[PDB]
């Protein structure tokens, strides 16, 4: 009186509530589900999905192709099946014809393209190339799968993981990397570009904000005024470096509560309120904080350079010679139509970046920082950001302290 | 040509930008500020706020009242000035008359009321009571400040921190605690109540949701159906305990990717989609997760109990006898009008809590958990919450896996 499986299944060791009492159980529903699911075949799927004993058929095939010969590490041979699991159901033949035909789904799977491009994966040691030498094929000159014919020994004796490594990383070593590098570009340039441009925009907004922040500069003049008022003649100044910002908290008042910065804020808020807008005006500076304009600029170069290199290999490199390829390999049918569009994105990007660099550096000279100094460039926005946060913390404290005093003076 | 201070001030050691060049400096503005600030007196405040040398006047008073006698630890005497800094400007006389008069600002300062109620602060060791014994006053019977007259020695010889401890924690030890306990209640019952009621509402919403979640129960029946289908006869069940929920991930399918839970989700989503509403319906269960209905219930009791105790001390305790008080002490003028309203909040709260307990426990029996078991009560909502999150994670994985397959089957 319940559907039952023909083959024994995995068990669920639940703690059963002994009886259908004054509870949520015993409404009859569960059996209706059992019946419904059964009619719809769901139970039959479950029966295969959770059979307790591995099908004898697959059991042996896996026991057999597990004793064969392998020259790959326990790690590599392992992560091979992992990263290519979506192809568990294909014969090395089809899986390989999959990667070489470059099939649309293959390319749209970012994780495999990376794995097939991994260093330790692509790089074949001298020994390994020897170990696999016996079963190796050449392909150079071969104009079709059904015309090569040089077996030299047998591949099937090799475990699946090694059969793949062989067919690609070894038999194509003469140009595997270049092939991958080529495809990785065709399959990334689009978003890499967007990403880069995204970051580049954050920088542009920050630069603009600082560039046009009269309030910020005004606060700076208030700080300068007060500063000169306190300092003796040896320390009088016409202006100050940004380092100055990070040291306005080390000075406390008599009662030792308030900080120099608190007073500045108090002075601004109660005498030149508008100046405080700079806090809002400079959110873009707070946002760009997690971006190294140094790293960004280099990323562009690498972006362009990668596209460049691929173009070389395609015109005079390991990919200029198409008879050196595997008959089934078709990187070029995919790659070539794309290069010009990728290059186009590269140029676009470069132009923007160069403009930004220009404006940024020019902004630094405005605040007396050296555009030459690597560190100075990198810490430029942090300094404004930290200051802003400090100002905020100070404004907070003053608003608090003032409220208490607004009370005490009453009572 | 710049306002200058008469008394030397603290210095700001900034790194000056050497010259007003093609930069933000040298617009003349800073000097206008210096002049403006000066006219408005701001510079004069700054002059006092950041003078480099402590005023000689205050210097001595602080050197003098720093050599006097003290029997208080380095810690206590210290945190005394800290927690009462807002009263730095008052004579021990006024500060003390401040705390005893209960002044509105004093009560509205949660931090002092707590400090004055601290254990190690209120508790006077036998030795200390002796050390201070000489300068001690009694007050019992005394009907006015200007009629006590028993000095017994001199208090002024005592450091400020000790002069306070004395005037209150010692001379009033006969009822200090009760006095504080009384005021702490008058000054907290209002928000304590709101807080408690707030938490209590979270619990009520969760209870309701689970109470009325047919979808949840339906999922449970689907799980039961499938479960019985897989299990042998020894494990057949009419229902299962919640522990069952946390063990639906330990069962994997052949390929070893999917989990039993993934299938359940798949089954629900593709056959009984509406059932999935339970995920939305039960957000209140996710929210109540950070509340121990056990702790909450006790907090009420403590809430009521505190109010009770104060009522006792007021009617027959250390606060029933008003001639035992300090002439300036007026807890009762504040306390008494309030007790009835606090008690009222206590009763209100209790009534709600008792109702909630009722419903909650009754909800547990619905899912087969023991309302008696301390742990069972405490983990009740976590179990549903964890399950919900797990279901969500599973739904996520299935949606992913399915998309990849939606691709692969195409190409």
PDB file of N, CA, C and O in Angstrom, chain A residues 226 229 263 266-268 270-272, chain B residues 33-34 36-49:
ATOM      1  N   UNK A 226      43.631  78.942  11.295  1.00  0.00           N
ATOM      2  CA  UNK A 226      43.790  78.489  12.675  1.00  0.00           C
ATOM      3  C   UNK A 226      45.224  78.010  12.909  1.00  0.00           C
ATOM      4  O   UNK A 226      45.896  78.429  13.861  1.00  0.00           O
ATOM      5  N   UNK A 229      47.595  80.679  13.266  1.00  0.00           N
ATOM      6  CA  UNK A 229      47.330  81.419  14.482  1.00  0.00           C
ATOM      7  C   UNK A 229      48.038  80.763  15.659  1.00  0.00           C
ATOM      8  O   UNK A 229      48.612  81.443  16.501  1.00  0.00           O
ATOM      9  N   UNK A 263      37.418  71.122  16.898  1.00  0.00           N
ATOM     10  CA  UNK A 263      37.236  72.572  16.825  1.00  0.00           C
ATOM     11  C   UNK A 263      37.046  73.053  15.406  1.00  0.00           C
ATOM     12  O   UNK A 263      36.165  73.883  15.137  1.00  0.00           O
ATOM     13  N   UNK A 266      33.627  72.353  14.466  1.00  0.00           N
ATOM     14  CA  UNK A 266      32.763  73.278  15.182  1.00  0.00           C
ATOM     15  C   UNK A 266      32.803  74.648  14.490  1.00  0.00           C
ATOM     16  O   UNK A 266      31.758  75.255  14.215  1.00  0.00           O
ATOM     17  N   UNK A 267      34.011  75.122  14.200  1.00  0.00           N
ATOM     18  CA  UNK A 267      34.172  76.414  13.550  1.00  0.00           C
ATOM     19  C   UNK A 267      33.451  76.483  12.217  1.00  0.00           C
ATOM     20  O   UNK A 267      32.817  77.493  11.895  1.00  0.00           O
ATOM     21  N   UNK A 268      33.555  75.407  11.442  1.00  0.00           N
ATOM     22  CA  UNK A 268      32.928  75.348  10.125  1.00  0.00           C
ATOM     23  C   UNK A 268      31.409  75.309  10.226  1.00  0.00           C
ATOM     24  O   UNK A 268      30.699  76.113   9.611  1.00  0.00           O
ATOM     25  N   UNK A 270      29.413  76.145  12.693  1.00  0.00           N
ATOM     26  CA  UNK A 270      28.754  77.306  13.275  1.00  0.00           C
ATOM     27  C   UNK A 270      29.095  78.641  12.642  1.00  0.00           C
ATOM     28  O   UNK A 270      28.548  79.657  13.048  1.00  0.00           O
ATOM     29  N   UNK A 271      29.987  78.657  11.660  1.00  0.00           N
ATOM     30  CA  UNK A 271      30.361  79.919  11.031  1.00  0.00           C
ATOM     31  C   UNK A 271      30.297  79.878   9.513  1.00  0.00           C
ATOM     32  O   UNK A 271      30.035  80.890   8.869  1.00  0.00           O
ATOM     33  N   UNK A 272      30.547  78.710   8.939  1.00  0.00           N
ATOM     34  CA  UNK A 272      30.506  78.572   7.491  1.00  0.00           C
ATOM     35  C   UNK A 272      29.838  77.252   7.157  1.00  0.00           C
ATOM     36  O   UNK A 272      30.415  76.401   6.482  1.00  0.00           O
TER      37      UNK A 272
ATOM     38  N   UNK B  33      39.851  84.597   6.688  1.00  0.00           N
ATOM     39  CA  UNK B  33      39.315  83.742   7.744  1.00  0.00           C
ATOM     40  C   UNK B  33      39.922  84.115   9.077  1.00  0.00           C
ATOM     41  O   UNK B  33      39.211  84.255  10.080  1.00  0.00           O
ATOM     42  N   UNK B  34      41.243  84.259   9.083  1.00  0.00           N
ATOM     43  CA  UNK B  34      41.942  84.633  10.297  1.00  0.00           C
ATOM     44  C   UNK B  34      41.295  85.905  10.844  1.00  0.00           C
ATOM     45  O   UNK B  34      40.975  85.995  12.032  1.00  0.00           O
ATOM     46  N   UNK B  36      38.246  87.242  10.062  1.00  0.00           N
ATOM     47  CA  UNK B  36      36.848  87.023  10.411  1.00  0.00           C
ATOM     48  C   UNK B  36      36.734  86.312  11.758  1.00  0.00           C
ATOM     49  O   UNK B  36      36.057  86.792  12.669  1.00  0.00           O
ATOM     50  N   UNK B  37      37.404  85.168  11.882  1.00  0.00           N
ATOM     51  CA  UNK B  37      37.370  84.391  13.119  1.00  0.00           C
ATOM     52  C   UNK B  37      37.742  85.247  14.303  1.00  0.00           C
ATOM     53  O   UNK B  37      37.095  85.188  15.354  1.00  0.00           O
ATOM     54  N   UNK B  38      38.796  86.035  14.134  1.00  0.00           N
ATOM     55  CA  UNK B  38      39.230  86.897  15.208  1.00  0.00           C
ATOM     56  C   UNK B  38      38.111  87.837  15.645  1.00  0.00           C
ATOM     57  O   UNK B  38      37.830  87.931  16.839  1.00  0.00           O
ATOM     58  N   UNK B  39      37.479  88.532  14.697  1.00  0.00           N
ATOM     59  CA  UNK B  39      36.402  89.467  15.054  1.00  0.00           C
ATOM     60  C   UNK B  39      35.273  88.791  15.816  1.00  0.00           C
ATOM     61  O   UNK B  39      34.705  89.379  16.729  1.00  0.00           O
ATOM     62  N   UNK B  40      34.944  87.563  15.434  1.00  0.00           N
ATOM     63  CA  UNK B  40      33.865  86.831  16.088  1.00  0.00           C
ATOM     64  C   UNK B  40      34.256  86.192  17.427  1.00  0.00           C
ATOM     65  O   UNK B  40      33.438  85.519  18.056  1.00  0.00           O
ATOM     66  N   UNK B  41      35.503  86.385  17.855  1.00  0.00           N
ATOM     67  CA  UNK B  41      35.951  85.826  19.124  1.00  0.00           C
ATOM     68  C   UNK B  41      36.390  84.370  19.097  1.00  0.00           C
ATOM     69  O   UNK B  41      36.937  83.851  20.077  1.00  0.00           O
ATOM     70  N   UNK B  42      36.150  83.696  17.982  1.00  0.00           N
ATOM     71  CA  UNK B  42      36.537  82.302  17.857  1.00  0.00           C
ATOM     72  C   UNK B  42      38.013  82.138  18.194  1.00  0.00           C
ATOM     73  O   UNK B  42      38.386  81.234  18.938  1.00  0.00           O
ATOM     74  N   UNK B  43      38.859  83.010  17.665  1.00  0.00           N
ATOM     75  CA  UNK B  43      40.273  82.884  17.971  1.00  0.00           C
ATOM     76  C   UNK B  43      40.535  82.973  19.483  1.00  0.00           C
ATOM     77  O   UNK B  43      41.402  82.284  20.019  1.00  0.00           O
ATOM     78  N   UNK B  44      39.775  83.806  20.181  1.00  0.00           N
ATOM     79  CA  UNK B  44      39.966  83.938  21.621  1.00  0.00           C
ATOM     80  C   UNK B  44      39.612  82.644  22.344  1.00  0.00           C
ATOM     81  O   UNK B  44      40.267  82.282  23.327  1.00  0.00           O
ATOM     82  N   UNK B  45      38.571  81.954  21.878  1.00  0.00           N
ATOM     83  CA  UNK B  45      38.200  80.683  22.507  1.00  0.00           C
ATOM     84  C   UNK B  45      39.353  79.717  22.275  1.00  0.00           C
ATOM     85  O   UNK B  45      39.823  79.051  23.200  1.00  0.00           O
ATOM     86  N   UNK B  46      39.808  79.657  21.029  1.00  0.00           N
ATOM     87  CA  UNK B  46      40.893  78.769  20.655  1.00  0.00           C
ATOM     88  C   UNK B  46      42.098  78.992  21.545  1.00  0.00           C
ATOM     89  O   UNK B  46      42.807  78.049  21.909  1.00  0.00           O
ATOM     90  N   UNK B  47      42.320  80.259  21.879  1.00  0.00           N
ATOM     91  CA  UNK B  47      43.445  80.660  22.699  1.00  0.00           C
ATOM     92  C   UNK B  47      43.371  80.048  24.082  1.00  0.00           C
ATOM     93  O   UNK B  47      44.393  79.757  24.704  1.00  0.00           O
ATOM     94  N   UNK B  48      42.162  79.858  24.577  1.00  0.00           N
ATOM     95  CA  UNK B  48      42.023  79.254  25.889  1.00  0.00           C
ATOM     96  C   UNK B  48      42.027  77.746  25.719  1.00  0.00           C
ATOM     97  O   UNK B  48      42.668  77.031  26.478  1.00  0.00           O
ATOM     98  N   UNK B  49      41.325  77.278  24.693  1.00  0.00           N
ATOM     99  CA  UNK B  49      41.206  75.860  24.419  1.00  0.00           C
ATOM    100  C   UNK B  49      42.536  75.176  24.142  1.00  0.00           C
ATOM    101  O   UNK B  49      42.721  74.014  24.491  1.00  0.00           O
TER     102      UNK B  49
END
